[PDB]
Amino acid sequence: FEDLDALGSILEEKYGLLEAHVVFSPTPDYAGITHDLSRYGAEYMHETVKDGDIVGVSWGTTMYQIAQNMQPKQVKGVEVVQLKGGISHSRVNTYSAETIQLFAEAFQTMPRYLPLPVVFDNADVKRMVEKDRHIERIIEMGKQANIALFTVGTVRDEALLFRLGYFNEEEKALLKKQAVGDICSRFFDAKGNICSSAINDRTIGVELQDLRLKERSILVAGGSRKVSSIHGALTGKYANVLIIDQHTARALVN
Amino acid sequence: FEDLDALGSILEEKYGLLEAHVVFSPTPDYAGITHDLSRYGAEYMHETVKDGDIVGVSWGTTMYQIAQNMQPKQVKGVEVVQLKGGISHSRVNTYSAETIQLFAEAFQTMPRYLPLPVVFDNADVKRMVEKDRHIERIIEMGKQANIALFTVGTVRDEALLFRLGYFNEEEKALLKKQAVGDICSRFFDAKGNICSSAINDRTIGVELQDLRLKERSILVAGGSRKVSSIHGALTGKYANVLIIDQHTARALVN
Ligand SMILES: *CC[C@H](O)[C@H](O)COP(=O)(O)O
Ligand SMILES: *CC[C@H](O)[C@H](O)COP(=O)(O)O
Ligand SMILES: [Co+2]
Ligand SMILES: [Co+2]
Ligand SMILES: [Mg+2]
Ligand SMILES: [Mg+2]
Ligand code: NI
Ligand code: NI
Ligand code: NI
Ligand code: NI
Ligand code: NI
Ligand code: NI
């Protein structure tokens, strides 16, 4: 038995967080953890979002589970914006559109989509694509967002970001060796530093340093497979609110 | 009363078509015509598509109605590919994804999406985007397609292609004055000639001259608002199969 409050305050002081929410999940398996964290993430969002908020959302399996658990809230003037594009160049679907739809619906608004892949083949195309005024507006809304909600990814073989046709096998091998994970599809190492300036320069979406400026940058993540990823993310100070299970919390404190 | 067979053979000889299918629609209103043409289009597709076919589909209100009326067919080895991207930069939705999903489902396959807008801000970005190998593959499948299904659009104020954030007001004014319509979002005049090489050079999707090479290039269109558009399309020889109502057929013969 962990005093979840004790673990929370330890994480808060260790990583300089505004809030650490240690959620009880009875078993250490990833599915079970994720389910419990997604549930509390949805409750936290419902409690937190208020009139006039600009809310940035990520995508992926965690974010879709949170979305699926969202319940409506009577708020006015809320904007919900996609923080990174979710277009795939493979048959694999990110469900980014469905995820943001569910969040926007909860908050009585319509989704502000970012209708792009997150990674492009080269920095020249990225720079030409990002200059489209519609894209610029969406990226600027992502910067304005006072609330950002995301997870951290892994570099496992079946990592979603390795299945979307973005990367060649040399790049995947590099990331598997040199990154611990991604936030919004930007890859960092164990110290939170950007792994590859070249790959980062091919990416359209919220910049990691911009997350540090927000009223709430909320990281929802847990499981043994994400311990190192979370540690990197927190070391980089990319989130000020952490929603985590007690197994993973203990692993980080230890 | 029109002998629909007589009108058909007249259109066939007038425009050098492989097939003209004159569909009876009792009233001249656009909704009524479109419904009847969409229904027969779905039946024609069901009858026509066979094992191994590569089928290219367009999008828009006509194409979505056809899609909604499609019934399944037990065929093997069929590919269904999007002929032009359907991403919008406004809140207006083309339903391109839902349209191709319904066609692919009918033909026992999964959609080959073109995850792009059809028009880009400038020719430089278009050229850089089209070089992505995934995009190249989809465009090449569109060229390989032995069956292409499309409508022709108008240049009315509420034309779908004027509502997607592609064009500034100067460009819309130019197109309204100088084009009669579009096939797959490429604009032509009354003689079937491309209106603007500049706008055409900003467009990713099936090239009009490539439609002329296919076993079946199927144009489904009717209504007084599309008479001039259809005439331009047929004058350019972009379709070898026409599905049209008897009101519009009479207007073209007259
Ligand atoms: C946007 C990509 C996510 O950061 C991550 O790689 C995948 O999310 P899940 O781990 O929740 O699938
Ligand atoms: C892909 C655009 C279509 O050619 C056309 O502009 C619109 O289709 P509907 O006329 O069927 O809406
Ligand atoms: Co190899
Ligand atoms: Co004006
Ligand atoms: Mg549980
Ligand atoms: Mg009818
Ligand atoms: Ni409430
Ligand atoms: Ni450390
Ligand atoms: Ni444990
Ligand atoms: Ni049949
Ligand atoms: Ni003529
Ligand atoms: Ni009539």
Curated annotation (Swiss-Prot), chains A, B:
GO biological process: regulation of DNA-templated transcription initiation
Quaternary structure, from the entry: Homooctamer.
Protein's name in the database: Deoxyribonucleoside regulator
Family the UniProt entry places it in: Belongs to the SorC transcriptional regulatory family.
Keyword DNA-binding: yes
Extra information: Deoxyribose-5-phosphate is most likely the effector that modulates binding of DeoR to DNA.
Protein purpose: Negative regulator of the dra-nupC-pdp operon. DeoR binds cooperatively to the operator DNA, which consists of a palindrome and a direct repeat sequence located 3' to the palindrome.
Assigned keywords, A-Z: DNA-binding, Repressor, Transcription, Transcription regulation
Annotated source species: Bacillus subtilis (strain 168)
Keyword Methyltransferase in annotation: no
Superkingdom field: Bacteria
